[PDB]
Amino acid sequence: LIEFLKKPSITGEGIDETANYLKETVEKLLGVKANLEKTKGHPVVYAEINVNAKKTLLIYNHYPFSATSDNKGTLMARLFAIKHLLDKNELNVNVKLLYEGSVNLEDYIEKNTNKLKADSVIMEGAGLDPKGRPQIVLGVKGLLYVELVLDYGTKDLHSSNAPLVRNPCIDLAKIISTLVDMGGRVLIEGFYDDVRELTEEERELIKKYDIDVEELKKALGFKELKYNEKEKIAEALLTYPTCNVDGFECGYTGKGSKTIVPHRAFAKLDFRLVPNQDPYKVFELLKKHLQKAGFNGEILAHGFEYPVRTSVNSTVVKAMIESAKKVYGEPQVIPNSAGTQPMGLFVYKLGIRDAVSAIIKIDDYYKAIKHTEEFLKLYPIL
Amino acid sequence: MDEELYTLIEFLKKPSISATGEGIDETANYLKETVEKLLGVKANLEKTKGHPVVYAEINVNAKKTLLIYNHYDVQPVDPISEWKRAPFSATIENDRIYARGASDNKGTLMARLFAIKHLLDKNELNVNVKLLYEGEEEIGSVNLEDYIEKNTNKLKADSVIMEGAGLDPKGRPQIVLGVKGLLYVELVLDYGTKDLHSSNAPLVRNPCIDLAKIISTLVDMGGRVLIEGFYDDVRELTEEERELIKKYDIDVEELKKALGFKELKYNEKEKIAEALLTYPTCNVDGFECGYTGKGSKTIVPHRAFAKLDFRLVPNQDPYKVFELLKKHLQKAGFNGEILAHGFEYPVRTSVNSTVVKAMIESAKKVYGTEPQVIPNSAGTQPMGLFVYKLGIRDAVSAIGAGGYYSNAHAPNENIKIDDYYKAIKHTEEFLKLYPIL
């Protein structure tokens, strides 16, 4: 881990060193041949461990620097566990290893669907959380990123000409204002039609979800939150889709005053999606809305990602919960994160029904190793 | 090269960007010294809360007194890369002088000075002249009123001429009988100490959207201002004023190409003239919030701000409009800071004053074409202070070393050397004629 931690692999600098090293390391520890696959994006490290087991599992990870947590240790911890089970011959599950708005990546998976078949899949991993209790996230919100651009002429005009032209700042401001109401509810027609109610189990988890409001509010730094009750906060943070403005720039915004009609304006939007919303469908709904709103400019989109919620009752989740309790001594389980990851690629392109994202202090790493071990042993028998 | 041209070049080589303050004090001192040299009277650097004012009186015991206003400060020159010649080289090429400030407003300032000199040298000056050169015109003349209010008796005059006006696209001299008023405003929202991961969006208000919603309430889609009471003080045009607008000569296609916008709101020339000269505005100069630049960064920004300028027409009071705006922002649930500056009054004066008449007739004699007379400029100038605070009703903006070709407020600003000489000439004829009418 220290050797893996020391090597840097950022801008695309010094990456091949870790890729070849990792390709060299998976073999030494597990004894199985490790493949390094070229791609339009960045190369992918792939390895397969077959114990002729009933169930097959997919493991997913991604490969100041003196080393004295972005998979800086989560990757190594899971590896030594499988190594520890291989030596004892107690391993009873097939394991495929895949090491990586995520615009690319999907291209690799689509051309290797048969190779990557598995009953369940485990994502990059989950941290220890503020409480120190093991945190298990059962999914992610989807994503749609959009940029809107208005360009009404070749140059800014002196503002004295304002009576003669349209101003793109006010135009784009008005467009943006039609997207949501005062309380943040999205006004795009059909936006909520695909949002499904929560299951009873999903509702139970949100109720059980323990957030300290005062600590959350303090850590955010905003003068005021829309909600004060912890139940309400959990519900909104994890269940509500959004239409958020990440950016808006137009005209002169430096010190003093330069009086003009700008010729160009743009704004960046991100939509957090929940099941069963489709980013491509939402994108179309947005375009229809913009047209009715008189939008006269350019639309650019990227980072289309699908939302995911994997049943807590599924054997892979049961295995993750019961194993954590044994090693950590209660695990905080949530139906999905507020954020977004390419979990949806493994559910809808590989058709892998059950996906979980769980399992730096030195004591945390060793725990992650044991937590991995206990899961790999309990999953086959569940 | 005669003294008229040489001195102008010398003047133009001195930077005097009021926005940064670069060269302001040197220029004011040179100008003071130059006034004394050329006219042989005492000139004074007078202090203000900001950049200094150059003042001088040329008394010839005449019955009439003229107050002449100009400004020695110039616009910034960034980006320097777009300039073919250094902004302050005052390079001569193609019988033109290339420098920031050539048109707005040093050429016109210096022409007038040399006209006065010529008349003095011939004992032909029959009007007392008071000179008032400020250094903050390009930054809204912030500290000019305070100076004027303490020197009202000293600045007494029967008439006033403002910074002046260049030749129109057809090359005809322009006579301008007023200005639109002005109110700069900055709105700021700050909801937290730092940007948040947009994944938190359901928990908080977003300042970008809130501010976008606020500015959206200010105007309808056509640009009409929705602030309650905004138009109440706006008075109808006089018959003469309506007449002048009808005569205002606009090449619509040449104008459209000059501006460079894909579309204009109007196609008829009279409608453009009306909108440009008669409509008050609520314009957004800027809106900044959250992440800008290449690629995607996902956040809830904690801060958003916008900059607005309101162009005003008679009888709107900028201080009143500010109050109306504030009442409006209350109702719209505005929750942030409001900062204002550059309060300027709109102005319109009579075409029938002798100073205007003297200006029309002199322009006609010197340029040999029909002067174009408009009731006010689309832009702003501190004419309001002279008319309302000093009580000088007879005010006009005319005489100009520059023209349509001049690229004022733009790179490669320049004036034709021949236009500089005609400007001196226009001023001479104006000064000979004003006292006899």
Ligand SMILES: [Zn+2]
């Ligand atoms: Zn000027």
